[PDB]
Amino acid sequence: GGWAIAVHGGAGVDPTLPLERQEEAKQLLTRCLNLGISALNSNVPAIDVVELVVRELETDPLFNSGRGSALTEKGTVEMEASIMDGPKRRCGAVSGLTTVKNPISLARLVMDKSPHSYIAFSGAEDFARQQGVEVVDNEYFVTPDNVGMLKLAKEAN
Amino acid sequence: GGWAIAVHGGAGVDPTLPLERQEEAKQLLTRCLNLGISALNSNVPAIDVVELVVRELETDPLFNSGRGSALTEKGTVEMEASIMDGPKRRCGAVSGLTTVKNPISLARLVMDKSPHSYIAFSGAEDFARQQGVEVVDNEYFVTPDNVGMLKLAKEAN
Amino acid sequence: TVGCVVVDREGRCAAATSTGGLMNKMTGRIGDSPLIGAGTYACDVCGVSCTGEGEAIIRGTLAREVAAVMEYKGLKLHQAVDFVIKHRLDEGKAGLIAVSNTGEVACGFNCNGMFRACATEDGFMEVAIWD
Amino acid sequence: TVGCVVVDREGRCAAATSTGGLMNKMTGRIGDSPLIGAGTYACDVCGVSCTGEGEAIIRGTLAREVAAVMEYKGLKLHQAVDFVIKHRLDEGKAGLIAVSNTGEVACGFNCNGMFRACATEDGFMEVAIWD
Ligand SMILES: N[C@@H](CC(=O)O)C(=O)O
Ligand SMILES: [K+]
Ligand SMILES: [K+]
Ligand SMILES: [K+]
Ligand SMILES: [K+]
Numbered sequence: 001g002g003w004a005i006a007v008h009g010g011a012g013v014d015p016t017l018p019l020e021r022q023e024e025a026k027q028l029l030t031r032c033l034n035l036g037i038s039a040l041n042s043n044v045p046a047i048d049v050v051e052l053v054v055r056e057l058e059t060d061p062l063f064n065s066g067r068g069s070a071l072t073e074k075g076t077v078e079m080e081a082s083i084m085d086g087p088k089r090r091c092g093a094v095s096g097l098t099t100v101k102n103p104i105s106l107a108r109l110v111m112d113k114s115p116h117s118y119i120a121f122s123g124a125e126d127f128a129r130q131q132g133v134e135v136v137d138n139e140y141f142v143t144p145d146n147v148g149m150l151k152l153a154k155e156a157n
Numbered sequence: 158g159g160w161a162i163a164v165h166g167g168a169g170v171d172p173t174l175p176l177e178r179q180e181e182a183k184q185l186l187t188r189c190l191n192l193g194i195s196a197l198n199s200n201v202p203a204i205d206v207v208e209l210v211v212r213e214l215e216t217d218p219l220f221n222s223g224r225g226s227a228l229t230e231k232g233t234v235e236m237e238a239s240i241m242d243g244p245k246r247r248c249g250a251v252s253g254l255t256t257v258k259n260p261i262s263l264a265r266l267v268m269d270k271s272p273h274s275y276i277a278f279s280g281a282e283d284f285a286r287q288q289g290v291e292v293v294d295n296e297y298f299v300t301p302d303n304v305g306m307l308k309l310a311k312e313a314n
Numbered sequence: 315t316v317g318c319v320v321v322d323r324e325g326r327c328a329a330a331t332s333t334g335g336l337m338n339k340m341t342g343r344i345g346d347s348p349l350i351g352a353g354t355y356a357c358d359v360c361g362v363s364c365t366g367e368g369e370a371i372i373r374g375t376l377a378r379e380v381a382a383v384m385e386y387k388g389l390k391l392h393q394a395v396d397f398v399i400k401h402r403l404d405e406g407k408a409g410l411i412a413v414s415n416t417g418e419v420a421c422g423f424n425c426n427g428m429f430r431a432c433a434t435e436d437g438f439m440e441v442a443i444w445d
Numbered sequence: 446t447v448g449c450v451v452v453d454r455e456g457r458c459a460a461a462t463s464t465g466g467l468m469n470k471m472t473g474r475i476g477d478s479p480l481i482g483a484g485t486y487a488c489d490v491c492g493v494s495c496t497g498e499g500e501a502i503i504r505g506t507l508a509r510e511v512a513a514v515m516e517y518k519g520l521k522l523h524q525a526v527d528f529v530i531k532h533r534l535d536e537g538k539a540g541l542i543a544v545s546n547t548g549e550v551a552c553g554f555n556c557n558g559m560f561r562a563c564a565t566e567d568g569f570m571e572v573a574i575w576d
Contacts (some may be wrong), residue, residue, distance in 0.1 A: 002566035003453050009560030010464075011497040011540030013574055020575060023461040024449035025560055031574045033562040036451065040566070046453040046492070049572050057447035058463055060498040063560070065447040066394075069465020072472050078528070080479040086458030086487035089373040089404075093479040096278060104463045116343045117369045118479065120254060121278040123342020141465070150512075153469040159417040159435030166429030167315045168366045168409030170443055179443055186431040186441045193320065194433055203361070207330035214316035215332055217378070222316040222365050226334025229341050236334055237348040243327030243356035243415070246504040250348040253473075261332045261359070264348070270384040273474045274500050279472020303337075310338040351482045351506040375482040378506045379513075386517035 003037040003040040007032050007053055009063040025062060032056045047085045054081075061143050066102060068143045071150040077141040079103045080120075083111060096121030099135040100128045109133070160197040164189050165240060171280045179266060189213050197240040204242040204265075211238070211261040215284040217307045218300050223259060225300050235275075253278030258291040266290070315347055317363030318364060319356070321413040325433070327361035329354050329377070346371035351378035359384050360391065362412045366425060370406020374398075381411050395422035446478055448485070448494030452544040458492035460485050460508070460544075467499060477502035482509035490515050491522065493543045497556060501537025511543050521545070527560040 007029055020035050036053045040046075058066025069077045081103035082093035092111030095118075109131045110119050119127050128135055164186060171178075175255035193210045201209075202268025215223030226234040238260035244271075254260050266288050267276055276284050285292055315333040322328075331354040333347040345355035345368030353364045355377035362377040371377075379402055383394045391414040399408070399422040409423025411430055419432040421442075431441035446455075446464040449558060462485040464478040476499030477483035478529045486508035487494045492496060493508040514520050522545035530541070530553045542552025550563045562572040 001548050004450070004544050004548055004563070005449065005451045006494075006542035006544060006550055006552060006561060006563040007449045008447065008494065008496055008540070008542050008552070008562075011536065011554050012556045013558035013560065025574065026572050029562040031559060032449070033570070033572065035566055036449065037453070037564050037570075040451065040453055042547040043454060045455070046451040046457045046459040049451045049453070050449045050459045050492075052448040053451075054447060054463050057449070061467060063447050064465050065463045068464075070464075070468040072474075074472055077465055078470075078473070079463070080475060080483040081461070081463035082462040082479040082481055084459065084481060084485050084487040084492075086460075086489060086492055089488055091369075091373050092482045093344075093481060093485075093545070095344075095475045095479050096459055096473065102459050107461075107463075108499040110479045112534075114340065115369075116340060117372050118344040118349075119340060119343050120342045120475075120479075121473070123340055126341060146465075146468075151467055157469075158323070158325075159433045160321060160392050161413045161432070161433040161438075163363075163411035163413060163421065163430060164319065165315075165317045165363065165409075165411050165421070165431075167363055168423045168425040168428040169407065169426035170425070170429065172426050174380040174443075177329075178509060179435075182429050182443060183431075183441050186429060188396060189318070190397045190431040190433055190441065192437075193318065195437070197320065197322060200323060203320040204322070205326035206320045206322065207318045207328045207361075210315060210318040210320075211330045211332050214318070218318045221334045222332040226336075227337040227339070229343070230338050231341055232427055234334060235339075235341070235343075236332070237344060238330070239348040239350060239354040240330040240331035241328065241356040241361075243349060243358060243361055246357055247349050248500070248504050250354075250475075252344050252348045252475075253342065259433045261330050264330075266392075271471065274350070274503050275475040276471060276474045277344075277348075277475055278342075280471055283472060294328045298334075307338055345453075349480060349482075350503055351509060353481075353507075372481050375486075375506070375509050378482060378509060382513045382517065386513060 004035040028060055029063050051108050054093050055102050057125055058102050069141050071146050081107045082106045091117045093118040094124050098138050101134040162193045185217055185219050208265050212259045215259050224298050226298050228303050233295055236260045240264045241261040248274040251281045255295045256292040257285045315365040317405045319361040319363050319411050319413045325415045327356045329356040329361040329363045351375050357381050360414050364410040366408030367406045371408050374402035391418040392420045395420040399424050446496040450492040450494050450542050450544040456546045458487045460487040460492040460494045462494045482506050488512050490546050495541040497539025498537045502539050522549045523551050526551045
């Protein structure tokens with residue numbers, strides 16, 4: 001009858017992955033879970049905890065989201081996310097984000113500050129600026145490893 | 158063990174819609190169902206029938222899809238569509254279309270001729286050209302009937 | 315929004331939905347129509363296409379739900395349809411059309427009306443606006 | 446893909462999923478992550494977040510299914526997740542994490558591994574990749 005929380009960093013793991021990269025991933029999961037654990041102890045609502053925990057997962061370049069996102073055929077980043085509040089089944093979702101620092105919070109904002117449930121690409125970029133969220137150039141989200149992964153993926157084809 | 162088919166043109170009827178407009182609507186619905194009925198008597202697979210019937214619904218300017226689409230806050234047209242084939246639960250979807258003459262057919266193409274289920278905005282426009290479907294200027298989609306209803310809607314705030 | 319659901323002589327269901335979306339909608343707004351499980355769904359048992367308030371159809375997963383209540387509550391098609399309109403809408407206005415793999419056909423809605431038409435091979439045929 | 450599911454002390458569920466999508470995806474491709482009912486779902490009885498092969502999770506309506514088999518088959522949270530995973534994936538590889546309104550927590554997948562962590566106020570805590 002008390003709080004619970006899960007976090008994930010994606011399914012499908014490289015079996016060729018170094019022990020150290022694996023510890024780093026674990027460190028990250030722990031830190032994020034911990035933000036959640038402490039938040040639930042201070043009695044913050046479940047809907048706020050999912051957002052703040054995902055913000056940390058987006059900001060750290062390890063996993064495939066926010067900074068460190070996978071790359072398109074074009075070598076750029078297009079991000080997307082969704083959030084939902086159980087009680088009254090409230091929903092927000094975004095796609096085609098190119099400059100928005102934390103997609104999950106824009107989704108949260110679609111839920112709370114727009115008549116819609118899902119806004120995408122240019123119109124979602126314009127929503128970002130109306131809501132004054134932190135935005136940045138696309139290059140910010142692109143990391144070296146993802147660039148190497150893209151080359152390797154293009155070659156498998 | 159027999160075929161069945163339904164066809165719709167949107168829930169939410171003008172509570173006072175003229176008999177005149179009602180007859181047009183029923184006639185269109187009849188014409189569309191007929192294409193469907195005939196296809197089914199000739200043993201066309203269901204997935205082919207839904208597509209061909211919705212093209213007729215998209216081309217005719219009466220309902221809100223294709224030509225005759227509702228307008229965005231900017232007074233243009235952004236169209237979306239999806240399609241699914243029951244037996245293997247195969248999917249295709251498109252959103253943010255501005256030039257594609259028949260959105261449902263692009264969605265069929267996503268399902269059959271792309272590694273993805275869902276492609277939207279610019280990327281979907283590009284896929285339209287990669288697949289050589291009929292494209293036109295966005296103006297083609299705007300009916301004077303719709304321009305009027307937007308003016309009326311934007312004032313209604 | 316326009317749509318079409320079919321079950322053929324082979325028992326195969328399929329569904330298709332296409333729309334311009336909500337009038338005056340914000341640029342880039344995406345409704346229920348292109349979202350599998352929301353505006354459109356088809357599996358072994360049925361084929362469904364929805365129309366109405368997108369935001370309400372999305373949070374209701376309406377199309378998938380028609381299939382869900384038949385698989386898990388074992389309802390009949392016409393009931394599944396009507397169960398779904400009653401309990402998944404919560405002040406939202408929507409409707410939908412559906413076929414089953416047994417050659418059944420249903421509509422359902424909670425709006426003043428829905429432009430629809432349906433037929434079966436034994437020769438049923440209705441075209442309707444109100445009801 | 447990354448995600449978090451949470452039930453608080455009030456028994457309220459919520460879920461969030463965020464991603465850069467699939468490496469080398471075509472421009473404008475949308476996966477399961479921003480799709481309510483596929484990648485993310487939360488209701489009265491649960492909160493779910495999925496990751497894995499978008500197309501499988503999408504056709505699978507995965508996140509909504511965990512809730513459905515609870516609300517319609519009466520199954521408890523852990524049974525639900527195993528049910529949806531083993532008996533609703535079909536050759537597609539995906540995982541999910543989920544929370545119940547009763548204070549329970551659950552992970553589940555069919556691929557080689559899933560980066561994940563869960564805690565339960567019982568002082569129960571764990572963080573894994575394989576298993
Ligand atoms: N389903 C459409 C509207 C309609 O059904 O007429 C939407 O919400 O975008
Ligand atoms: K990240
Ligand atoms: K909203
Ligand atoms: K039309
Ligand atoms: K495909």
